[PDB]
């Protein structure tokens, strides 16, 4: 059985969700439908699912989604990880925090600095939840975020072109 | 054979180093003297020792300190550590960035400059979080007792299951461990 | 269950891909077709697949190719590899830098520019060496048969003990392995 | 027994070899002398020893040095190393090669480019020989090169302030 960890970008980036349907809620509905007939496991971190529910009005599709996708918190599960990954992660957060500062520079600036760095911290956390969950399960990471795909590849994690999730699932009935 | 990992706070916080002497470099020398004849192993992470050097002028004490205290990197390869250290790191970089921005506000008013001050406050914020991770990681790896005059770090150690002592008790324990 | 790691050369070198078809995208499609019904596992390192994409327009073949061929990163964590790969890497970056500087000379004469050309020739020189290390490393890790139309890489594989085949024989072996 | 891997800088950087003696050949002679009475092992990679003999006229001190220091080629010994170190090394070579290019830029430029990059390759090789030998033996790396010390620290290798080699050896009779 193939296991897949899904990012929010899967259902919020039209270049990805158009393979299911051009309509966003219909794309998700089609994903849910196909998943229930696919010989595969699907996981999404809890932080990422919280973001997904905050940005898309799922309505009745939420409890349907909760029948096909395992929503898990890799932090609350207490994983062990090689010390080299812990320092790779810190470099990734450092770099993300510096991006947040260059962003605040392009925009007193107190108000702009606090919000740019808070977003960069939250981005870092959700990314690590996605990479830890993939690592723990030895799963295929599916993401429309090229930056997270490069990060997953630096640490050996398996990927697909997220534009081929539907094609892959259909060849896994 | 009791093993200890030392924080900078032990030789920086006067509440902690007064147990050795009121004099700060006298406190360090007394600690060094006790560490010479002991059944105790003493460790400090490399990054923490660097900070120690920057905020204290050891002079001719540095070679003796580097001999009695084993300065090591916790970036070991075959070692597995709890993923909770990534989350501790995130939680601390958050609080230190918030503190850092409050401090760069004050300083820029007393003195462009605010861009350089905010940049400094966060580079320091990261350095301090990574230094705390080095301390907790080296304790975890060596199954050592963490000695820290910093309560924030102690609460974190307790969270991840690291053995602690009241740092005010270090000299009495070192006196026991003398050969 | 025979496992193979493919180089870009197999679908780029016409001496190798002619065994499938004279047509280059027909050769790739025939390979894909054979790989669909086999007791063979096919792998390609992620960095090598990227290069493949840049020098060939697969179009609607890409999703099928990414399904039959497993695109993986050889940056695995618990894995031990021979230190000889560091030395192979050094030896190749040497020769590729030397080649690169000869090529940037020629091109700048036909066309500042030479600073940009030398910079490009070495960034490509590094990329190509790291791509060769990804190929050999993924073979070593999976204990796979390396398939490469590049003789330089074959001599290197033989050095480190990696199993090889004559890449001109890939279609006949794939025909055997069909279910 | 403490094991030590020595860099060339130990005997070519006056800030380091002055602890033995202000005279360079006398500093080496004093090191050799003390080493023979120290309860410790001393190693130097063969590439680094070749550099050391090429830059200092050792004379009769060479065969004396060969009685106290093990000269070993970590490449010819066939080590195994975690895959994460192999990619850390490639980044270090990339960065070293880029330095070599920025150096050639500060100085047709063909002649200057070939020599700057050749030196950067050789620096990279000798550094990795020093770090591999330290890793294999679980040794203390001794080096006056701050860049190599930072590299060794990124990969968990043990260090000393090379200005304290003599003091350390004297407390290890």
Sheet strands side by side (includes C69-72): C69-72, C41-45, C3-6, C145-147, C163-164
- Taking contacts as CB-CB distances below 8 angstroms, the residues of chain D near B62 are 161
Residue to substitute from A84, A85, A86, A154, interface D, most D β-carbons within 10 A = A84
In degrees, rounded to 5, the angle at the alpha carbon of residue D77 between the alpha carbons of residues D75 and D82 is 70
In this complex, how many residue pairs, one in chain A and one in chain B, have their CB atoms less than 8 Å apart?
Answer: 84
The DSSP element (H or E) to which C44 belongs, if any, is strand C41-45
Please report, for chain B, how many H helices and E strands are present, in that order.
Answer: 8, 6
CA distance B54 to B8: 11
CA distance C165 to A152: 31
- Of all residues in chain D, the one with the smallest CA distance to B69 is D160
CA distance D106 to A36: 63
Tokens standing for residue B111:
């003195």
CB contact under 8 A, A79 and B77: no
CB contact under 8 A, D156 and B62: no
SS3 category, C5: strand
Tell me the β-bridge partners of D41: D3
CA distance D131 to B55: 30
CA distance D35 to B27: 34
CA distance B7 to B16: 11
**Contact in structure between B33 and B174 (CB atoms under 8 Å):** no
CA distances from B13 to A80, B6, B96 (A): 33, 13, 19
Q: Which alpha helices (DSSP H) does A14-60 contain, by range? A: 14-17, 24-35, 46-55
Residue to substitute from B47, B83, B108, B138, interface A, most A β-carbons within 10 A = B83
CB contact under 8 A, D161 and B46: no
CB contact under 8 A, D81 and C80: yes
Number of other CB atoms surrounding residue A52 within 10 Å: 23
Shortest Cα–Cα distance, A90 to chain D (Å)? 13
Which residue from B46, B66, B67 is facing D153, i.e. has the nearest CB?
B46
Q: Which residues of B participate in the annotated binding site for Mg(2+)?
A: 7, 51, 128, 132, 150
What are the φ and ψ backbone dihedral angles of D71, each rounded to 5 degrees? -100, 110
If you search the block for the tokens 């605040």, which residue do you land on?
A: A104
Of B114, B106, B163, B110, which Cα lies nearest the Cα of B136? B163
Tokens standing for residue D15:
């800030």
CB contact under 8 A, A125 and B90: yes
If you search the block for the tokens 């895959």, which residue do you land on?
A: D83
Shortest Cα–Cα distance, A78 to chain D (Å)? 24
**Contact in structure between D44 and D12 (CB atoms under 8 Å):** no
CA distance D86 to C85: 8
**Contact in structure between A70 and A42 (CB atoms under 8 Å):** yes
CA distance D60 to C172: 65
CA distance A94 to B93: 10
Whether chain A has a CB inside 8 Å of the CB on B126: the answer is yes
CA B84: distance to chain centroid? 19
CA distance B63 to D162: 10
Tokens standing for residue A59:
């309505």
Residue to substitute from D81, D82, D84, D90, interface A, most A β-carbons within 10 A = D84
If you search the block for the tokens 């601390």, which residue do you land on?
A: B92
**Contact in structure between C169 and C176 (CB atoms under 8 Å):** no
Number of other CB atoms surrounding residue D159 within 10 Å: 20
- Taking contacts as CB-CB distances below 8 angstroms, the residues of chain A near D82 are 84
CB contact under 8 A, B80 and A79: no
In degrees, rounded to 5, the angle at the alpha carbon of residue A137 between the alpha carbons of residues A132 and A142 is 70
Shortest Cα–Cα distance, C79 to chain A (Å)? 11
Q: Which residues of D participate in the annotated binding site for Mg(2+)?
A: 7, 51, 123, 127, 145
**Contact in structure between B73 and D150 (CB atoms under 8 Å):** no
Which residue from A81, A86, A97 is facing B122, i.e. has the nearest CB?
A97
CA distance C11 to C25: 9
CB contact under 8 A, C73 and A168: no
For C117, residues 6+ apart whose C-beta sits below 8 A from its C-beta are C104, C107, C108
CB contact under 8 A, C93 and D89: no
CA B3: distance to chain centroid? 15
Which residue from B80, B114, B141 is facing A81, i.e. has the nearest CB?
B80
CA distance A47 to A54: 11
If you search the block for the tokens 């924080």, which residue do you land on?
A: B7
SS3 category, A6: strand
CB contact under 8 A, D161 and B78: no
CA distance B89 to B87: 5
| Residue ranges of domains in chain D, CATH in brackets | 2-170 (3.40.50.1010)
Tokens standing for residue A13:
């980036």
CA B36: distance to chain centroid? 20
Looking at residue D56, the DSSP 8-state letter turns out to be S
**Contact in structure between B24 and B56 (CB atoms under 8 Å):** yes
Residue to substitute from C97, C104, C108, interface D, most D β-carbons within 10 A = C97
CA distances from A81 to A123, B82, C22, D87 (A): 20, 6, 49, 18
Q: Are strands A80-82 and B80-82 parallel, antiparallel or unpaired?
A: antiparallel
Burial degree of B60 (CB within 10 A; 0-12, 13-18, 19+): exposed
CA distance A121 to B93: 8
Number of other CB atoms surrounding residue C110 within 10 Å: 5
Shortest Cα–Cα distance, C74 to chain A (Å)? 6
**Contact in structure between A116 and A100 (CB atoms under 8 Å):** yes
In this complex, how many residue pairs, one in chain A and one in chain D, have their CB atoms less than 8 Å apart?
Answer: 3
CB contact under 8 A, C75 and A158: no
For A33, residues 6+ apart whose C-beta sits below 8 A from its C-beta are none
CB contact under 8 A, B76 and D154: no
Which residue from A86, A121, A125 is facing B85, i.e. has the nearest CB?
A86
- Taking contacts as CB-CB distances below 8 angstroms, the residues of chain C near A164 are 63, 66-67
CB contact under 8 A, A89 and B89: yes
For C5, residues 6+ apart whose C-beta sits below 8 A from its C-beta are C43, C44, C45, C135, C138, C139, C142, C144, C145, C146, C147
If you search the block for the tokens 């279609």, which residue do you land on?
A: C171
- Taking contacts as CB-CB distances below 8 angstroms, the residues of chain B near A47 are none
Tokens standing for residue B68:
């009695």
In chain A, what is the straight-line distance between the N-terminal and C-terminal CA atoms, in Å? Answer: 11
CA distance C167 to D23: 62
CA distances from A46 to A64, A66, A131, B173 (A): 16, 11, 13, 46
The DSSP element (H or E) to which C80 belongs, if any, is strand C80-82
- Greatest C-alpha distance within chain A: 57
CA B44: distance to chain centroid? 7
Q: Which residues of D participate in the annotated binding site?
A: 7, 51, 123, 127, 145
A contact residues 40-99, partner D, Cβ 8 Å cutoff: 82, 84
Beta strands in A88-173 (DSSP E): 140-142, 158-159
Which residue from C62, C63, C76 is facing A156, i.e. has the nearest CB?
C76
CA distance B38 to C86: 43
Of C88, C87, C32, C93, which Cα lies nearest the Cα of C60? C32
**Contact in structure between C142 and C5 (CB atoms under 8 Å):** yes
**Residue length, chain B?**
179
CA distances from D6 to B54, B74, C162, D137, D171 (A): 27, 22, 34, 13, 18
CB contact under 8 A, A86 and B87: no
**Contact in structure between C138 and C144 (CB atoms under 8 Å):** yes
Tokens standing for residue C110:
């036909």
Number of other CB atoms surrounding residue C143 within 10 Å: 9
Of A58, A44, A61, A59, which Cα lies nearest the Cα of A8? A44
Q: In the Cβ-directed half-sphere of D136, how many Cα atoms lie within 13 Å?
A: 21
- Taking contacts as CB-CB distances below 8 angstroms, the residues of chain A near B141 are 83
SS3 category, C75: coil
- Taking contacts as CB-CB distances below 8 angstroms, the residues of chain C near D93 are 89-90, 93, 126
Tokens standing for residue D17:
């070899």
Shortest Cα–Cα distance, A47 to chain B (Å)? 13
H, E, C per residue of B12-76: CCHHHHCCCCCCHHHHHHHHHHHHHCECCEEEEEHHHHHHHHHHCCCHHHHHHHHHHEEEECCCC
CA distance C42 to C63: 15
- The answer to the question of whether A2 is labelled as a binding residue is no
Residue to substitute from A40, A86, A132, A153, interface C, most C β-carbons within 10 A = A153
If you search the block for the tokens 């330290």, which residue do you land on?
A: D134
**Contact in structure between A60 and A29 (CB atoms under 8 Å):** no
If you search the block for the tokens 């740019």, which residue do you land on?
A: A116
């Amino acid at each position: 059985m193939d296991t897949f960890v899904l990012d929010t970008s899967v259902f919020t980036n039209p270049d990805v969700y158009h393979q299911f349907e051009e309509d966003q809620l219909g794309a998700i509905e089609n994903f849910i439908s196909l998943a229930s007939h696919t010989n595969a496991n699907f996981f999404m971190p809890t932080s990422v699912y919280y973001e997904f529910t905050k940005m898309v009005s799922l309505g009745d599709l939420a409890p349907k989604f909760e029948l096909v996708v395992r929503i898990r918190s890799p932090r609350k599960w207490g994983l062990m990880v090689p010390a080299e990954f812990l320092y790779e992660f810190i470099e990734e957060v450092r770099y993300r925090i510096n991006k947040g500062l260059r962003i605040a520079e392009e925009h007193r600036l107190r108000e702009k600095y606090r919000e740019a760095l808070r977003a960069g911290i939250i981005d870092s956390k959700e990314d690590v939840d996605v990479l830890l969950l993939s690592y723990e399960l030895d799963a295929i990471l599916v993401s429309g975020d090229e930056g997270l795909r490069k990060w997953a590849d630096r640490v050996g994690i398996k990927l697909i072109d997220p534009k081929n999730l539907r094609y892959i699932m259909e060849n896994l009935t």
